[PDB]
Design a protein around this ligand. Structure first.
Ligand SMILES: [Zn+2]
Lengths: 121, 208, 73, 83, 125, 155
RNA sequence: AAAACUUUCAGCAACGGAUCUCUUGGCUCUCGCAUCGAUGAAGAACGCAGCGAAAUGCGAUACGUAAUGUGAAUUGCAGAAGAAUCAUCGAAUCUUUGAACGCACAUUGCGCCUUUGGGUUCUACCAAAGGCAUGCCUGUUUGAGUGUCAU
RNA sequence: CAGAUCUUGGUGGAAGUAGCAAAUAUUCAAAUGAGAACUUUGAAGACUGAAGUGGGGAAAGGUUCCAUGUGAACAGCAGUU
RNA sequence: GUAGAGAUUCUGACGUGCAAAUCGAUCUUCAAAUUUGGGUAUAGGGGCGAAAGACUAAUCGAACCAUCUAGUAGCUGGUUCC
RNA sequence: UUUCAAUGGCCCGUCUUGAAACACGGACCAAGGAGUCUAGCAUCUAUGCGAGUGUUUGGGUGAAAAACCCAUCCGCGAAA
RNA sequence: UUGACCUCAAAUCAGGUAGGACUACGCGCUGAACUUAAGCAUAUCAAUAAGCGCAGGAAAAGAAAAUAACCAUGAUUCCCUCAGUAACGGCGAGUGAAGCGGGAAAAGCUCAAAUUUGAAAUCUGGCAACAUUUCUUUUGUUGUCCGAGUUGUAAUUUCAAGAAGCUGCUUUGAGUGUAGACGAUCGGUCUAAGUUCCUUGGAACAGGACGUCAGAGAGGGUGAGAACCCCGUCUUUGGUCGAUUGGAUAUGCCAUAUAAAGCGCUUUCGAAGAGUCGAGUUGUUUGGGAAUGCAGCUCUAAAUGGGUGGUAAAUUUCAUCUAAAGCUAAAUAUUGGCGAGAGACCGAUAGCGAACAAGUAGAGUGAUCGAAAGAUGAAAAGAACUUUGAAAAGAGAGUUAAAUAGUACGUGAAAUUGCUGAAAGGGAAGCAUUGGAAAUCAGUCUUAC
């Protein structure tokens, strides 16, 4: 079985040959299944399918991380790379601009804050 | 309560007269067993029940506080009569005295073994054995409803200060442990019947 | 409760104690206080005189607190 | 007041499959779905048809996104990879 | 008595949880007690059953029968034990399933994860 | 159609009232919720009392003017007499009622001695620890959560 | 008038599915929580497994991939050998649609823009990728006016 | 609960009864088969008689097409079709 | 006069039908105010009507669907053990 | 228990002055199937207290939708 | 002629935003009828259903153009009470509030109208730098250009005041680490004791002996009633180790008070929201009655002016409040969604329509309509084999504790049906009463003294 960690520590072009070889192997296995194949071949069909899925996952994550590195510290970045929590969360006021205050309120909070007090018995 | 729309979710009007049928509402449409069948009636299958039960029925009921206190005092007085304890079903034929009062050192019991020990020297363990032997499967639909087992009531331990007595005694089957400041008639007169066997602590008895 | 009531003693008796000649009909005499001058007048006059018409003058925005005056002997 | 011999002339659809709700309720000549109101932006919906609402309301389908959102809410909408 | 309110005493809920338990949860639901020698050697009362373990049947018509666990058949809550079989009419042999609570483990198939499990459950090895 | 003894019926039940029946099965639940919220507030707000001091006022009618109840806040005139500025009164837990007024010296004095008792028994922590400014206490080791009613009840 | 027949009673056997027992369901109450969508939602359509119709799950990475946790299964057969129809879940995939957005649509219908690539075939044809809705807001750019003037 | 032309489901007498009578009509041999008035082949007798009971299409249906296989069930007799 | 479109009579057949309107005979029309397919328009106190209160999916002196609605009941029926 | 003989015995339910009715409903069996709950009122009865009475709007207290306890109001009653 | 500006356009211009779904509870609009009044038209139903628009985790309301007439209260919301009361009503049926008082919860504030005028002190965007992160996904900072803005962006002020002045005390960061402590927090983990004998059984989880544990005798599972067989339960508001958060604390660094602020007195001054208030009128609403609110139309203020004081008018006093601009937590709601715990609930014609492949099969052009249906056994051990038959099957045998459990499967009622035995019968049957016949059967007795 193809394991993701040595899949990740290779290059994109090398993984391209592995992906194409796996696709050809799946095509051969499907031809074997329709011409009459054993359970061993039919089990290799699902194994090859998952190996293709693992490789395609590795290509996509390498591509996305490269896009993240290229767009790091950029004011505008691709939408799919931005946050997706909820539509409302993205539309809400940020904590910075929720906490913005006038100089009138800054003076009031500076000079007369809520005091820590206690009462004697 | 039942669903307030249970039995009315269908659409069905009376077909009327002239069809050799009872004038009840009947389900329209076709291609199904339900079509042409009855609806909207207590006599009808899948209909509404007569006078469906409501949530705003009176479940809780008021008693005058003075009459609640009357009953609590009467139940405590009943617990002080040996004849009522025997009649209600308590195996107190061997206990030393009524009311059975134990020292405040009992409040500091930390182990169930100590509690079952004390019960054996005060000869209160016959009541516990009675409770254990009376454990049965509940008869009827109760056990389908988190009412799986039934058993008798054992001694009622009443304490003043808690430093372990509750945890030491609570696993003994049938034994109930209550503070003297908050005595309950549900536990002083189980089943509405007077004369429960009560084991008092010295401080609890003094605070009575 | 329910077990010490009627309809546990009329189980078996036809008409459920409302009679055969007249039966238990929905509102044979009208709903609520309907009447009082037309067909309920006999009950209304002999058991509730003074029910119809106005007596006295109206007070708008009556407030009880300025009128509060309990009396002790 | 003609039954048989009149049902034999019925071979002309008045409704076809709707592209939005998938039901055979798309009036051709009106170009409107009797079920969901397509092509209107809103969905045909009426409070007298309470049973009609529950036949197609939220939860009768997959809710694949809403299931993902609920899982993400339970853990606080965090992003990144665990260390 | 139970005093927590995060745990349920409902028969409906407890039966649903047991019979709807996934494979990982059924792994713990299928636990067997250790023999006296294993209990005094590992300071463990019970471990979940694993394939390849050695057990002895303690209850039922097969009481006293011994054999290696060939398959812990989780979806029926059954253990299939080698040579614990039944002769069908046609001449073939069908396995007889034994619940994990009705067997006693007399030898464990020790792995480094099983050793970690033993020492994690207040034991030693 | 009304033939029995008793008073004439008056049941206002000709609308759809079952739609709006309100039950109280959550009364014990709400009581516990209010208890938990009150205890959460008690632990969160530090030594500060859970209830602010309130003035002693008289209800406005002949039916109730012989009694004394709790008001909303102390008037600006009362705060000036007690020597507390309106800017600091809200910070140290003294409510301010800009709408009320002292039409009598009796009401003025009543609430002034209330503020004086509160000020005498109040421990104000320094804003920065170890640097007592004006009004700040020098020792705050004995600070406790006490009840304003016990310290200063409505008489 | 004996048998048949009819009726009654009982036994056995049928027909039927009452009753009793059960119950991963319903109903009601309480407690707690606040989270959909143009970054494509709710819904719909068609597909996806070695052997599947549905349900359940998923989207051409198609009864799932990554990551984390557990630790040796799955199971009807076959079958192989960090397993698993396991749990969790912060990374991804997410077909045709749908507010649905190039125009349409009882037509896998009809267009346009940019880039790239293909081959016995190269001004041809084809393929792939990325785009082209409306209203409004800030700004930019290009403007129009016998609108107001300066010059 | 004996009633409500009650509700749902089940089952009777009628009763082996009404009935299976429009569209001219079938018959012989052989084959197959456990089983043939009905299947198939041959022979005969007939009919639709070109505005057809022929050969095609549109609307509608949707796999009914085709070969192979056949315990039932369905083809209101039968059935190897 | 045929096809086709109709539907006068037998008040025939049938009338738990082959048929919730059919069959037989007889009959009316048969080159135009003709017959008809598909497309399209008109929708319920509305449409459409060479006009019968005809027709508008076997529903028409106000279609069908769902709700208000468990509408109302001086009226009929039933209303369970000793 | 079955059957026989003697005597007696109309089909039940229903509205009705009057039903065996040539008045209505009922072919049969099993299961389901109709004076309920709520806000009031009135008589009566039981209990507690009594010129008072009503803890449960709340607060306290219980790890517990129960029970226990509790300030100030307020309802009704003490005057028409 | 070039320019400036205004107005109005275009772009697949740069960057954003809106719809749809949901709708239990929120705010509005629109808006009935059945019903009741024993008819019915005002009324009632009902400011409801249906329809339409727009939100949130709550919404709305909210810091008095509020009450009251007091010794005065003091934003809003909700609860109790006020109160079935004042009042409205063919004064019929009916409808019907508020102030007070007690409680739950409490929190206050922001602009417009001011000359910064010795200095647009204000802000979006482009660019480039750094920094920061629930996060390469987030959020800022500094510099520099372009613009916006004098047809007004900051600072200062909000009537409770304030503003300018007059000395004089008092007060002061929108900061950043780092360290450890103290709390909270989803979660990975951790957890006491018989499976000893006998009997019954197919199975011991039963019965009986003998024990053990218990802060654990809740509840399930396991071949029948299991605290000790298994999962759990109690300990647990906890040990644990892995990340999270909170308010303090230790100091580190950055911070121009050259500032700002509260307070105190002014012989002073004090800007305060218009087709809006108000009035008439017409609708519609309300308990609001000589209009309660809202809306349409007409007329349209004012400056100690304008509201309001629940009988219209003029007049004169008195209180109170300060509209025509704005924000705001908590207490309150929640037939929906999500996660839990329950129950004197139902028990397969019941409970949701649906315990099951259920909004499914099926119906209808369509809107819509909408079922039936749970149970072999501990285990399929699902009947090998022989024999009869074309087969389906039967008969043996076999499995089982049981086939009086064979999938047409737990139990298996009645209607109704066949067989057997008995009996009866000349155009009904059933019943009651009394005895005969035939079948059937118990008591009593036998003994005790
Ligand atoms: Zn549609």
């Amino acid at each position: 079985a193809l394991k993701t960690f040595e899949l990740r520590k290779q290059s994109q072009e090398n993984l391209a040959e592995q992906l194409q070889e796996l696709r050809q192997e799946l095509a051969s296995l499907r031809v074997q299944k329709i011409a009459g194949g054993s359970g061993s071949k039919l089990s290799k069909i699902k194994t090859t399918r998952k190996d293709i899925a693992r490789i395609l996952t590795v290509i996509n994550e390498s591509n996305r991380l490269a896009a993240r590195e290229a767009y790091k510290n950029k004011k505008y970045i691709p939408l799919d790379l931005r946050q997706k929590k909820t539509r409302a969360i993205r539309r809400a006021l940020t904590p910075y601009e929720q906490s913005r205050k006038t100089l009138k309120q800054i003076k009031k909070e500076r000079y007369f804050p809520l005091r820590k007090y206690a009462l004697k018995a | 309560a039942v669903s307030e729309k249970a039995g009315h979710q269908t659409s069905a009007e009376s077909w009327g007269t002239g069809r050799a049928l009872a004038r009840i509402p009947r389900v329209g449409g076709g291609g199904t067993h339900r079509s042409g069948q009855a609806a909207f009636g207590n006599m009808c299958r899948s209909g509404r029940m007569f006078a469906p039960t409501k949530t705003w029925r009176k479940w809780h009921v008021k008693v005058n506080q003075n009459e609640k206190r009357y009953a609590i005092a009467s139940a405590v007085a009943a617990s002080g009569v040996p004849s009522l304890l025997l009649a209600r079903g308590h195996r107190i034929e061997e206990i030393p005295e009524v009311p059975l009062v134990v020292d405040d050192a009992v409040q500091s019991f930390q182990k169930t073994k100590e509690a079952v020990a004390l019960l054996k020297e005060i000869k209160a363990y016959r009541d516990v054995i009675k409770v254990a032997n009376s454990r049965k499967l509940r008869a009827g639909k109760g056990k389908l409803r988190n009412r799986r087992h039934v058993q008798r009531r054992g001694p009622l331990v009443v304490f003043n200060e808690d430093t372990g007595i509750v945890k030491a005694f609570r696993n003994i089957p049938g034994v109930e442990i209550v503070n003297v400041r908050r005595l309950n008639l549900l536990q002083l007169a189980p089943g509405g019947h007077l004369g429960r066997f009560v084991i008092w602590t010295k401080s609890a008895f003094g605070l009575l | 409760p329910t077990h010490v009531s009627k309809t546990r003693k009329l189980r078996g008796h036809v008409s459920a104690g409302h009679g055969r000649i007249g039966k238990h009909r929905k509102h044979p005499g009208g709903r609520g206080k309907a009447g009082g001058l037309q067909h309920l007048r006999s009950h209304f006059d002999k058991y509730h005189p003074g029910y119809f018409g106005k007596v006295g003058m109206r007070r708008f925005h009556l407030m009880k607190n300025p009128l509060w005056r309990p009396t002790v002997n | 007041t003609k039954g048989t011999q009149s049902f034999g002339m019925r071979h002309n659809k008045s409704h076809t499959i709707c592209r939005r709700c998938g039901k055979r309720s798309f009036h051709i000549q009106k170009s409107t779905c009797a079920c969901c109101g397509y092509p209107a932006a809103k969905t045909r919906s009426y409070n007298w048809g309470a049973k009609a609402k529950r036949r197609r309301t939220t939860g009768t389908g997959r809710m694949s996104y809403l299931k993902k959102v609920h899982r993400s809410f339970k853990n606080g909408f965090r992003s990144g990879k665990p260390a | 008595m139970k005093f927590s309110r995060d745990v349920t005493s409902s028969r409906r809920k407890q039966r649903k949880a047991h019979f709807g338990a996934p494979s990982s949860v059924r792994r713990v639901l299928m636990s067997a007690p250790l023999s006296k020698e294993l209990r005094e050697q590992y300071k463990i009362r019970s471990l979940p059953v694993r394939r390849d373990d050695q057990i002895t049947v303690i209850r039922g018509s097969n009481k006293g029968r011994e054999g290696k666990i060939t398959s812990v058949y989780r979806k029926k809550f059954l253990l299939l034990i080698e040579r614990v079989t039944r002769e069908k009419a046609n001449g073939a042999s069908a396995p007889v399933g034994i619940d994990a609570s009705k067997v006693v483990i007399t030898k464990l198939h020790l792995d480094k994860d099983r050793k970690d499990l033993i020492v994690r459950k207040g034991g030693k090895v | 159609a009304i033939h029995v003894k008793g008073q004439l019926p008056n049941a206002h039940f000709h609308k759809d009232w079952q739609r709006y029946v309100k039950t109280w099965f959550n009364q014990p639940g709400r009581k516990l919720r209010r208890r938990q919220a009150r205890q959460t507030k008690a632990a969160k707000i530090a030594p500060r009392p859970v209830e602010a001091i309130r003035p002693a006022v008289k209800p406005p009618t002949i039916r109730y003017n012989m009694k004394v109840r709790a008001g909303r806040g102390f008037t600006l005139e009362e705060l000036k007499a007690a020597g507390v500025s309106r800017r600091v009164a809200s910070t140290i837990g003294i409510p301010v009622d800009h709408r009320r007024r002292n039409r009598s010296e009796e009401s003025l004095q009543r609430n002034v001695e209330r503020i004086k008792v509160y000020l005498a028994h109040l421990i104000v922590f320094p804003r920065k620890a170890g640097q007592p400014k004006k009004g700040d206490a020098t020792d705050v080791s004995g600070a406790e959560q006490t009840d304003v009613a016990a310290v200063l009840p409505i008489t």
